[PDB]
RNA sequence: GUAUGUCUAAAUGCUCUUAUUUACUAACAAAAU
RNA sequence: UAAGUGAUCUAGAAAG
């Protein structure tokens, strides 16, 4: 037995119906962030050090 | 019209030559060309190219050019405004460089 | 600005029409716009979207995401399974 | 195409018709002004 | 495809490895330190030029609509918003600020793609309300950059210099590099050109955000990043743009430029980049150096990225070259010698003058390319060999070739040239700045891509024009043609393909008009009806077709070398009616540049004099050199200059307009307000009439005499009364849409009836018209109707009878 | 002259009709309005034609007035129209011949 | 293609001409004894 | 036989003036041409409700109307017209007038604008 | 591309008005500097 | 002492 599908694009009769109409991301997306934030921190601290000098 | 209905100077020159105007009118033609050149805002290679083409073509055209030049520095030079004069000079320089 | 009766009507229309037919629906609601209507639907109307709040773990996850995808907020929302504005 | 009425004479929203109307008003308006001033003058005299 | 790509990215992390990203960030930081860059803050409330900036943005927005008469609902809304902003500047500014601060979620960007028939482009239509904000940001950020020196001298599209001008400058620089044309000791100069492939399409948002944080207010950066990260719509499909910058949104251009800066830095290295820049306190102008020694030191000499299409001029010594070659060989062995095979050479040029394939020179270029590739990670940007080009100047290769901005330039030093022939038209004589010698030549040709684009444009004009008032079509054609010619004035003459296309395109356009009149019989349309201006009832086309095209030995043309012999027909049968050509009324680019150089110096001198004498320099004294220069001198003394001084990074914005709008500007390259009218074509108009015999001759074609007027002086069309007070029913029409009379073709036919219908017809079946003595040689469409109208109610008979009486 | 009516009443057609009337005697009693005052029609054939036309009209009226939306006022109006038609028909049955 | 208040202006030194055309084509109508209305044009 | 037909055939005796005169003579007698409410095709600009059966005929909906001249013109020399329509469901005669003072229409005892 | 469908028993001459059109058709096509 | 010869596409009717 096969269902009676309803199109999200077409309604020949206009027959209304009661609303018949992955989370993990790669190491990169964490790793990259780590690289970036850490780098930024380094730049900050390094910059401060330079200023002090 | 011929001068202005022509992409490169070469084409213009060719058109002029097609006409095959008498050795009388060559000087006149040259003068006209010069005037046209003057009229344009700054010196264009086109006119120079055309002149070169004409010059190569025949001794009479060379003679005409010479005559025109003579007329210019002698009697027609002081009439022009500065930019125009400069342009003319540039054209002449180009002609004379080679 | 969206009134509640209008919203209801829109919802009804969507069941009648089709979540990829935003001209007719727009026409039906004289003041609201076609491209706006769709946006509105995306935001509030569709049931599969979990507009309601959630546990602390989820919140924590969201915050982590925010830290590690600098305000790439639609993406974050998608990851969650939540809507965007609410998440923000 | 879309709006048909736009290709009709009778349609007032057609531009030609509008222009005509304006012209009519302008002429008539001018006439009124000419007369209005005269009327005012008369009143003043009175 | 895009959404698949996005999905893939989501699945398996960004292409950019974290370490690489970190390194890049570090490099950027270093660069900033070197430059001593004050980061751009968030716009304060009491910022000095904020209102001005806003106004500029508003103006820009208007300029999308001010032209077009038709407006959809969204457009109308946008207009309304703009108006509101104008009314209430302070409120609007505040709102914008708020949006910048808070709004990280946005309305979905619907995309149409446009039919540039060769290759379709996208168009990203952002929501009216956000759009304003974006525009403001673009205005502000660019201005800040200009102030603070974010972008160095070498990133040229952002600069206010016009693309042809830029090209010219580049050429000059190349000529002006010291000992650049010498080939005694085997000093091999390699010019590498290439596209940074998919550079927008592979930006990671996180990395981008971080980069921004370095240069802008973190909040601003965040706003930017979120804005890029939107739900793209199209018809029924939609997808979250999780990766890669969207080009269309207004500020995006700036972002792109910033990204490309990083790439440039990577290419150069740091020290070299710094050198190129100059010192921070007083940086170099484009391609100048504080010394010669420094310039000499590194292998790279000149750089310029243009809009993600970089140009590097390497100048090697022989020893240096050899090492590189060896390295290349080591990398990729070549026993069969297939390096000349699969090598991007310029087919537009001919086999002699194009880059010669010597087993040294070819290898060197390849090596250079490889090196360049190595310098950038593929994940950050794709620098492909199919995209790239490497010209190599050497003892064996005398032609330094490259394509910039749409030009194809062949720089050929006259010491290498055989016989230093008379300077042609098309060639720029490159000059040495020290000695003032015309030391090199540079031949131009419109790059094939540009030609293709032109063709596409023409097609577009033709297509979707079954209706249109002949005149409208003609106007469109003129616009197209003007764009073509004003952009490459000098560089047209040489390229024959372009000329051919023009001839064809023009003919097609003509036939469109003739298609309307359901004939195309060549006698029934003498050039009179097309080129005659609208002010004598013609279409007023602006021909570039009546040129006698250069033909040549196609045997020896593509091959080897060339000369201008045997002209081909050009476009039509003529009655010896030499229709002038738009090119002769446009001042070739070299001349313009020279003029600019002159009159700007002159202007400076004048200013100095004024200062000495203590006066404000009058605009009546500078008259003479008024409509002369780049920018046109007259850009100083227009009555709205103070505000346009704050519109910085404008050219780039204009360029990037392509991705925001459906139908774009065909004069993106220039901009009237900052440059002045770079061309003027009233002379042409004047002369066309003359060419066509004078006015009388033209009239004699027309029905003018049939009107029963003495002479054409003080006659006009569609005069009517004034109509302005009751003219606010229209929308961005600018009071009146066009001062030019449209000449609806029903009347056009009537006007030229006595040429269009005529006895010397080829094959027209001569029907006598109904109840009149008016022969029609074939069914001509509108003409007949007009005739009937004229001779309504048995008018002919009445006339005859009346006469008899 | 779009929509056919114009074409019908275009001058040429009218002329043709006139010609027909002149030679052979083709009239279209559909085409002209039936006269109000009878006894300005000496011919019998013409009268007969007129009568026929009126009968046809009456029939047409009848056909429409029994439509389903009976409470609408158009039907009511027609009822009077029908009566008028009947009267006309009766009149046309004059006793001169 | 195209090419009350002001009463005192009429009587300045410049020469002028009022032109009327109302009585150019004049007619008289009259019935005969038979009945025919004879529209006779008169001198205008 | 073809919509762009240059010359319609005339009989060999066709005095055009005479023909015209004849037509005129047989125009007062004529049924059509001697009547009001001549037909027209028009879309509805007002977007209004049919007063009898409340059928919401929207903007731009096409109808075969009757255009008739209103004798009482606007101002002097610019005419105004009655434009009859029927509602789709119930056959009630809706109409409207075109008063050009406002550059718009006026409802005429048919329906109401909304 | 000037849509379409049902519906059908077998007063006479006269002249005068015009530098226009209660004109109708939209199937056809749709852009700027 | 010798220039300037010739290469010349087309081409309308219906319906939509
Ligand atoms: Mg069809």
DSSP state of F33: P
Q: Please name every residue paired with G31 in a beta bridge, in sequence order, or none if there are none.
A: G37
Q: At what angle do helices E361-375 and E318-331 cross, to 10 degrees?
A: 70
Q: Please name every residue paired with E440 in a beta bridge, in sequence order, or none if there are none.
A: E413, E430
φ and ψ of B47, to 5 deg: -60, -45
DSSP state of E743: -
Distance CA B8, CA B1 (A): 14
Distance CA E686, CA E709 (A): 23
- The alpha helices in G1-44, defined as continuous H runs, are none
Q: Which chains touch F (3 or more CB pairs under 8 A)?
A: H
Q: Is the dihedral of CA E173, E176, E179, E181 positive or negative?
A: positive
- Spatial contact of E64 and E247, defined as CB atoms under 8 Å apart: no
Number of helices (H), then strands (E), in chain F: 4, 0
φ and ψ of E282, to 5 deg: -145, 85
Q: Is the dihedral of CA B4, B7, B8, B12 positive or negative?
A: negative
CA-to-C1' distance for F25 and I8, Å? 20
Q: Which of H30, H22, H25, H8 is nearest to F19 (CA)?
A: H22
Q: Is the dihedral of CA E760, E764, E766, E770 positive or negative?
A: negative
The rounded Cα E742 to chain-centroid distance in angstroms is: 28
| Nearest-CB residue to E210 (from A9, A27, A40) | A40
Distance CA E523, CA E517 (A): 13
DSSP state of H81: E
Residue E658: strand, helix, or coil = helix
Distance CA B46, CA B64 (A): 19
CA-angle at E328, arms to E322 and E334, nearest 5°: 105
Distance CA E362, CA E342 (A): 11
Residue whose entry in the numeric block shows the structure tokens 């895009």:
E2
G and B touching (3 or more beta-carbon pairs closer than 8 Å): no
Distance CA E498, CA E406 (A): 12
Q: At what angle do helices E73-87 and E128-148 cross, to 10 degrees?
A: 50
Among chain G residues, the shortest Cα distance to E717 is held by G1
Taking the CA of residue E201 as centre, how many other CA atoms within 13 Å lie in the half-sphere pointing to its CB?
11
Classify burial at D14, counting beta carbons within 10 Å of its beta carbon; exposed 0-12, middle 13-18, buried 19 or more.
Answer: middle
Polymer length in residues for chain F: 97
**Distance, first Cα to last Cα, chain F:** 44
Helix (H) or strand (E) holding H63: strand H62-69
What tokens appear for E800 in the block? 């005859």
Q: Is the dihedral of CA E632, E635, E636, E638 positive or negative?
A: positive
Label the pairing between strands E309-315 and E300-305: antiparallel
What tokens appear for F6 in the block? 């114009």
Question: What is the secondary structure of E395-427 as a DSSP string?
Answer: SS---EEEEEBTEEEEEEETTTSSS-PPP-SS-
Distance CA E675, CA F77 (A): 77
Distance CA E313, CA E272 (A): 13
- Spatial contact of E278 and E128, defined as CB atoms under 8 Å apart: no
Using CA atoms of E391, E394, E398, E404 in order, give the dihedral in degrees to the nearest 10.
30
Chain B residues whose beta carbon lies within 8 Å of the beta carbon of residue E427? 45
Neighbouring CB atoms inside 10 A of E91's CB total: 11
Residue E701: strand, helix, or coil = helix
Distance CA E166, CA C24 (A): 52
Helix (H) or strand (E) holding D38: helix D15-45
Residue to test with chain B: of E579, E591, E686, most B Cβ within 10 A = E591
Kindly give, in sequence order, each residue whose CB lies less than 8 Å from that of residue E508, ignoring residues fewer than 6 positions away.
E458, E462
CA-to-C1' distance for E514 and J16, Å? 20
Instruction: Compute the nearest-CA separation of E338 from chain D (Å).
Output: 59
Domain tally for chain D?
1
CA-to-C1' distance for F7 and J14, Å? 22
CA-to-C1' distance for E780 and J14, Å? 14
Q: What is chain H's alpha carbon radius of gyration, rounded to the nearest angstrom?
A: 20
What tokens appear for E99 in the block? 């949006």
Among chain C residues, the shortest Cα distance to E209 is held by C70
Distance CA E726, CA D18 (A): 9
Q: Is the CB of E567 under 7 A from strand J?
A: no
Residue D35: domain span? 1-46
- Spatial contact of E362 and E321, defined as CB atoms under 8 Å apart: no
Distance CA H73, CA E348 (A): 71
Domain tally for chain F?
1
φ and ψ of E444, to 5 deg: -115, 155
Residue whose entry in the numeric block shows the structure tokens 């604008």:
H113
Q: List for chain E the helix, strand, coil content (%; round to 5).
A: 45, 10, 45
Q: What is chain D's alpha carbon radius of gyration, rounded to the nearest angstrom?
A: 18
Distance CA H110, CA H114 (A): 13
- Spatial contact of C74 and E230, defined as CB atoms under 8 Å apart: yes
Label the pairing between strands E389-393 and H111-113: unpaired
A and H touching (3 or more beta-carbon pairs closer than 8 Å): no
Three state DSSP letters for E229-282: CCEEEECCEEEECCCCCCCCCCCHHHHHHHHHHHHHHHHHCHHHHHHHHCCCCC
- Spatial contact of H57 and H44, defined as CB atoms under 8 Å apart: yes
DSSP state of E706: G
Distance CA E334, CA E324 (A): 14
DSSP state of C43: I
Residue F9: domain span? 1-97
Instruction: Compute the nearest-CA separation of H63 from chain D (Å).
Output: 11
**Closest nucleotide relative to residue E520's CA, C1' based:** J11
Chain D residues whose beta carbon lies within 8 Å of the beta carbon of residue H106? none
The rounded Cα C70 to chain-centroid distance in angstroms is: 22
Distance CA E391, CA E189 (A): 9
Which residue numbers of H belong to the known binding site for Zn(2+)? 50, 53, 87, 90
Which residue numbers of H belong to the known binding site? 50, 53, 87, 90
| Nearest-CB residue to C71 (from E73, E104, E231) | E104
What tokens appear for E605 in the block? 């001198």
Residue B27: strand, helix, or coil = helix
Distance CA B37, CA B92 (A): 11
Kindly give, in sequence order, each residue whose CB lies less than 8 Å from that of residue F81, ignoring residues fewer than 6 positions away.
F61
Distance CA H59, CA H49 (A): 11
Q: What is the resolution of this structure in A?
A: 10.0
Distance CA D41, CA D28 (A): 20
Residue E778: strand, helix, or coil = coil
Instruction: Compute the nearest-CA separation of F9 from chain H (Å).
Output: 7
- The alpha helices in E419-577, defined as continuous H runs, are 448-462, 470-487, 496-516, 528-531, 554-557
Question: What is the secondary structure of C9-23 as a DSSP string?
Answer: HHHHHHHHS-TT-TT
φ and ψ of E562, to 5 deg: -150, 160
Beta-carbon separation of A8 and C20 below 8 A: yes
Kindly give, in sequence order, each residue whose CB lies less than 8 Å from that of residue E273, ignoring residues fewer than 6 positions away.
E31, E152, E264, E265
Distance CA G12, CA H11 (A): 64
Q: Is the dihedral of CA F27, F33, F34, F39 positive or negative?
A: negative
What tokens appear for E268 in the block? 């150069």
Neighbouring CB atoms inside 10 A of F52's CB total: 14
The rounded Cα F69 to chain-centroid distance in angstroms is: 27
- Spatial contact of H44 and H85, defined as CB atoms under 8 Å apart: yes
Q: Is the CB of E763 under 7 A from strand J?
A: yes
Which amino acid residue lies closest to nucleotide I21, measuring CA to C1'? Answer: D9
Instruction: Compute the nearest-CA separation of H20 from chain D (Å).
Output: 26
Q: Which chains touch G (3 or more CB pairs under 8 A)?
A: D, E
- The alpha helices in H1-114, defined as continuous H runs, are 16-25
**Distance, first Cα to last Cα, chain A:** 80
Q: Please name every residue paired with E304 in a beta bridge, in sequence order, or none if there are none.
A: E311
Chain C residues whose beta carbon lies within 8 Å of the beta carbon of residue A29? 68-69
CA of D1 to the centre of ligand 1 (A): 15
Distance CA E152, CA E141 (A): 15
Kindly give, in sequence order, each residue whose CB lies less than 8 Å from that of residue E762, ignoring residues fewer than 6 positions away.
E521, E523
E strands along A1-53, which residues?
none
Using CA atoms of E628, E633, E637, E640 in order, give the dihedral in degrees to the nearest 10.
100
DSSP state of E636: S
Q: Is the CB of B55 under 7 A from strand J?
A: no
- Spatial contact of E136 and E96, defined as CB atoms under 8 Å apart: yes
Q: Is the CB of B4 under 7 A from strand J?
A: no
Kindly give, in sequence order, each residue whose CB lies less than 8 Å from that of residue F40, ignoring residues fewer than 6 positions away.
none
Nucleotides of J under 7 A from a protein CB: 3-4, 7-16
Beta-carbon separation of A21 and C15 below 8 A: yes
What tokens appear for E65 in the block? 């609509």
Distance CA G11, CA G18 (A): 12
Residue E671: strand, helix, or coil = coil
E strands along chain D, which residues?
none
What tokens appear for E701 in the block? 């074609």
Polymer length in residues for chain D: 46
Q: Is the CB of B20 under 7 A from strand J?
A: yes
Residue H113: strand, helix, or coil = strand
DSSP state of B15: H
- Spatial contact of B65 and B54, defined as CB atoms under 8 Å apart: yes
- Spatial contact of E285 and E153, defined as CB atoms under 8 Å apart: yes
Classify burial at E510, counting beta carbons within 10 Å of its beta carbon; exposed 0-12, middle 13-18, buried 19 or more.
Answer: buried
G5 touches chain D (CB under 8 A): yes
Residue H112: strand, helix, or coil = strand
Residue E767: strand, helix, or coil = strand
- Spatial contact of E708 and E714, defined as CB atoms under 8 Å apart: no
Q: Which of E537, E528, E541, E539 is nearest to E707 (CA)?
A: E537
**Distance, first Cα to last Cα, chain G:** 37
Q: ω into residue E631 within 30 of 0, thus cis?
A: yes
What tokens appear for E444 in the block? 């131009």
Residue whose entry in the numeric block shows the structure tokens 């709008």:
E661
| CB contacts < 8 A (D, H) | 46
Residue H22: strand, helix, or coil = helix
| C-alpha pair distances (Å), E14 with each of E18, E22, E224, E246, F13 | 9, 13, 19, 17, 81
- Spatial contact of E320 and E299, defined as CB atoms under 8 Å apart: yes
Instruction: Please give the method by which this entry was determined.
Output: cryo-EM
Q: At what angle do helices F11-22 and H16-25 cross, to 10 degrees?
A: 80
DSSP state of F35: P
What tokens appear for E378 in the block? 């593929």
Question: What is the secondary structure of E551-608 as a DSSP string?
Answer: ---HHHHSSS-----SB---S---SS-----GGGGS--HHHHHHHHHHHHHHHHHHHH
Chain D residues whose beta carbon lies within 8 Å of the beta carbon of residue E742? none
Q: Which of E659, E654, E650 is nearest to E228 (CA)?
A: E659
Kindly give, in sequence order, each residue whose CB lies less than 8 Å from that of residue E219, ignoring residues fewer than 6 positions away.
E42, E100, E101
Q: Is the dihedral of CA E614, E619, E621, E627 positive or negative?
A: positive
What tokens appear for E150 in the block? 């974010």
What tokens appear for B51 in the block? 């002149």
φ and ψ of F87, to 5 deg: -60, -45
Q: Is the dihedral of CA E538, E542, E547, E550 positive or negative?
A: negative
- Spatial contact of H79 and H69, defined as CB atoms under 8 Å apart: yes
CA-angle at E406, arms to E404 and E408, nearest 5°: 60
- Spatial contact of E477 and E468, defined as CB atoms under 8 Å apart: no
- Spatial contact of E92 and E54, defined as CB atoms under 8 Å apart: yes
Q: Is the CB of E619 under 7 A from strand J?
A: no
Q: Please name every residue paired with H56 in a beta bridge, in sequence order, or none if there are none.
A: H49
Distance CA B5, CA E577 (A): 9
Q: Which of E254, E294, E305, E292 is nearest to E271 (CA)?
A: E294
Among chain E residues, the shortest Cα distance to D21 is held by E726
**Distance, first Cα to last Cα, chain C:** 20
Which amino acid residue lies closest to nucleotide I12, measuring CA to C1'? Answer: H25
Q: ω into residue E769 within 30 of 0, thus cis?
A: no
- Spatial contact of E55 and E643, defined as CB atoms under 8 Å apart: yes
């Amino acid at each position: 037995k096969i269902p009676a599908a309803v199109s999200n694009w077409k309604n020949p009769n206009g027959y209304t119906v009661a609303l018949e109409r992955n989370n993990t991301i790669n190491d990169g997306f964490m790793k990259l962030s780590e690289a970036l934030e850490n780098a930024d921190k380094k730049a900050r601290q390094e910059i401060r050090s330079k200023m002090e000098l | 019209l011929v001068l202005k209905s022509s992409l490169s100077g070469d084409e213009a020159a060719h058109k002029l030559l097609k006409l095959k105007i008498a050795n009388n009118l060559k000087k006149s033609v040259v003068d006209i060309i010069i005037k046209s050149s003057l009229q344009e805002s700054t010196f264009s290679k086109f006119y120079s190219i055309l002149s070169e083409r004409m010059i190569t073509f025949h001794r009479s055209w060379q003679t005409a050019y010479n005559e025109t030049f003579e007329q210019n520095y002698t009697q027609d030079i002081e009439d022009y405004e500065t930019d125009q004069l400069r342009i003319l000079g540039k054209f002449w320089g180009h002609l004379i460089s080679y | 600005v969206w009134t509640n009766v209008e919203d209801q009507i829109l919802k009804a229309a969507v069941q009648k029409y089709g979540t990829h037919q935003w001209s007719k629906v727009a026409s039906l609601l004289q003041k609201k716009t076609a491209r706006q209507s769709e946006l509105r639907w995306n935001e509030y109307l569709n049931p599969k979207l979990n507009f309601t709040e959630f546990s602390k773990e989820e919140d924590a996850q969201l915050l982590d995401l925010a830290r590690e995808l600098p305000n790439q907020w639609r993406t974050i929302a998608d990851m969650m399974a939540r809507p965007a504005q609410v998440c923000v | 195409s879309g709006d048909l009425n736009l290709l009709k004479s009778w349609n007032p929203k057609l531009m030609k018709n509008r222009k005509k109307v304006w012209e009519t008003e302008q002429d008539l308006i001018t006439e009124q002004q000419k007369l209005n001033t005269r009327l005012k003058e008369i009143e003043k005299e009175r | 495809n895009e959404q698949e790509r996005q999905r893939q990215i989501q699945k398996n992390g960004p292409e950019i490895t974290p370490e690489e990203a970190t390194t890049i960030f570090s490099v950027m930081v270093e660069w900033l330190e070197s430059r001593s860059f004050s980061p751009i803050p968030f716009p304060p409330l009491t910022y000095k030029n904020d209102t001005k900036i806003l106004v500029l943005a508003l103006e820009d927005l208007k300029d999308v609509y001010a032209s077009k008469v038709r407006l959809n609902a969204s457009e109308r809304e946008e207009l309304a918003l703009i108006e509101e902003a104008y009314d209430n500047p302070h409120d609007t500014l505040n709102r914008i600020k708020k949006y910048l601060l808070t709004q990280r979620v946005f309305k979905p960007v619907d995309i149409t793609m446009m039919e540039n028939y060769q290759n379709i482009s996208p168009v990203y239509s952002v929501d009216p309300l956000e759009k304003i904000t974006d525009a403001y940001l673009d205005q502000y950020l660019w201005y800040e950059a200009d102030q603070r020196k974010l972008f160095p001298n070498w990133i040229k599209p952002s600069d206010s210099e016009i693309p042809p001008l830029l090209v010219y400058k580049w050429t000059q620089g190349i000529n002006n590099l010291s000992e650049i044309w010498d080939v005694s000791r085997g000093q091999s100069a390699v010019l590498l050109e290439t596209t940074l492939g998919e550079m927008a399409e592979k930006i990671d948002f996180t990395l981008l955000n971080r980069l921004l944080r370095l240069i802008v207010d973190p909040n601003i950066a965040d706003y930017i990043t979120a804005k890029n990260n939107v739900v793209i719509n199209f018809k029924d499909m939609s997808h979250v743009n999780k990766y890669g910058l969207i080009r269309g949104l207004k500020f995006a251009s700036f972002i792109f430029q910033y990204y490309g800066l990083v790439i440039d830095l990577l290419l150069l290295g740091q020290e070299r980049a710094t050198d190129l820049a100059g010192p921070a306190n007083n940086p170099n102008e484009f391609m100048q150096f504080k010394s010669k020694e420094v310039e000499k030191a590194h292998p790279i000499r000149l750089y310029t990225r243009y809009l993600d299409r970089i140009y590097m001029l390497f100048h090697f010594e022989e020893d240096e070259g050899e090492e590189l070659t060896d390295e290349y060989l080591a990398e990729n062995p070549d026993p069969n010698f297939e390096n000349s095979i699969g090598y991007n050479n310029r087919k537009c040029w001919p086999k002699d003058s194009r880059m010669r394939l010597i087993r040294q020179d070819v290898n060197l270029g390849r090596a250079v390319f490889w090196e360049i590739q190595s310098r950038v990670p593929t994940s950050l940007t794709s620098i492909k060999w199919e995209n790239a080009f490497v010209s190599v100047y050497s003892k064996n290769n005398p032609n330094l070739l490259f394509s910039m901005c749409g030009f194809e330039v062949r720089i050929l030093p006259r010491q290498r040239m055989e016989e230093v022939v008379s300077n042609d038209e098309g060639v720029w004589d490159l000059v040495d700045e020290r000695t003032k010698q015309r030391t090199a030549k540079a031949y131009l040709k419109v790059s094939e891509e540009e030609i293709k684009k032109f063709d596409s444009r023409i097609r577009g004009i033709l297509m979707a024009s079954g209706s249109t008032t002949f005149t409208k079509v003609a106007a469109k054609w003129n616009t197209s043609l003007i764009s073509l010619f004003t952009y490459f004035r000098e560089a047209i003459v040489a390229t024959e393909p372009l000329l051919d296309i023009l001839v064809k395109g023009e003919t097609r356009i003509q036939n469109r008009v003739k298609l309307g009149l359901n004939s195309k019989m060549p006698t029934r349309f003498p050039p009179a009806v097309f080129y005659t201006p609208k002010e004598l009832g013609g279409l007023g086309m602006i021909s570039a077709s009546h040129i006698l095209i250069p033909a040549s030995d196609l045997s020896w043309s593509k091959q080897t070398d060339t000369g201008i012999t045997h002209f081909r027909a050009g476009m039509t049968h003529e009655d010896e009616k030499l229709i002038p050509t738009i090119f002769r009324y446009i001042t070739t680019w070299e001349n313009e540049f020279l003029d600019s150089q002159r009159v700007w110096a002159e202007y400076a001198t004048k200013r100095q004099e004024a200062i000495q004498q203590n006066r404000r320099l009058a605009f009546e004294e500078l008259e003479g050199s008024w409509d002369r220069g780049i920018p046109r001198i007259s850009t100083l003394f227009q009555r709205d200059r103070h505000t346009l001084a704050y519109d910085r990074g404008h050219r780039i914005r204009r360029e990037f307009k392509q991705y925001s709008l459906e139908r774009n500007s065909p004069f993106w390259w220039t901009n009237s307000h900052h440059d002045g009218k770079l061309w003027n074509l009233n002379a042409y108009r004047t002369d066309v009439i003359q060419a066509l015999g004078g006015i009388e001759t033209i009239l004699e074609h027309t029905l003018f005499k049939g009107t029963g007027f003495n002479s054409w002086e003080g006659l006009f069309w569609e005069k009517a009364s004034g109509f302005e007070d009751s003219m606010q029913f229209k929308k961005l029409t600018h009071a009146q849409r066009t001062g030019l009379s449209q000449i609806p073709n029903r009347r056009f036919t009537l006007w030229w009836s006595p040429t269009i219908n005529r006895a010397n017809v080829y094959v027209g079946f001569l029907v006598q018209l109904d109840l009149t003595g008016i022969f029609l040689h074939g069914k001509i469409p509108t003409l007949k109707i007009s005739l009937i109208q004229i001779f309504r109610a048995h008018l002919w008979q009445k006339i005859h009878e009346s006469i008899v009486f | 002259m779009s929509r056919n009516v114009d074409k019908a009443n275009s001058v040429l057609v009218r002329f043709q009709e006139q010609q027909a009337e002149s030679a052979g005697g083709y009239k279209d009693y559909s085409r002209y309005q039936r006269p109000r005052n009878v006894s300005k029609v000496k011919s019998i054939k013409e009268a007969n034609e007129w009568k026929r036309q009126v009968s046809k009209e009456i029939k047409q009226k009848s056909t429409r007035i029994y439509d389903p939306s009976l409470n609408e006022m158009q039907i009511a109006e027609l009822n009077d129209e029908l009566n008028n038609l009947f009267k006309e028909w009766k009149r046309w049955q004059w006793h001169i011949d | 293609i195209y090419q009350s208040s002001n009463y005192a202006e009429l009587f300045n030194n410049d020469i002028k001409l009022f032109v009327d055309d109302t009585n150019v084509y004049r007619v008289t109508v009259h019935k005969t004894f038979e009945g025919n209305v004879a529209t006779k044009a008169i001198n205008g | 036989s073809e919509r762009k037909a240059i010359n319609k055939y005339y009989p060999p005796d066709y005095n055009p003036l005479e023909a015209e005169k004849l037509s005129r003579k047989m125009a007062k007698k004529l049924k059509t041409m001697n009547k009001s409410h001549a037909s027209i095709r028009l879309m509805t600009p007002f977007s209004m409700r049919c007063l009898e059966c409340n059928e919401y005929i929207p903007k731009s909906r096409k109808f075969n109307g009757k255009k008739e001249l209103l004798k009482e013109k606007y101002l002097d020399s610019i005419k105004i017209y009655r434009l009859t329509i029927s509602c789709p469901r119930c056959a009630n005669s809706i109409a409207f007038r075109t008063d050009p003072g406002n550059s718009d229409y006026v409802m005429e005892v048919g329906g109401v604008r909304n």
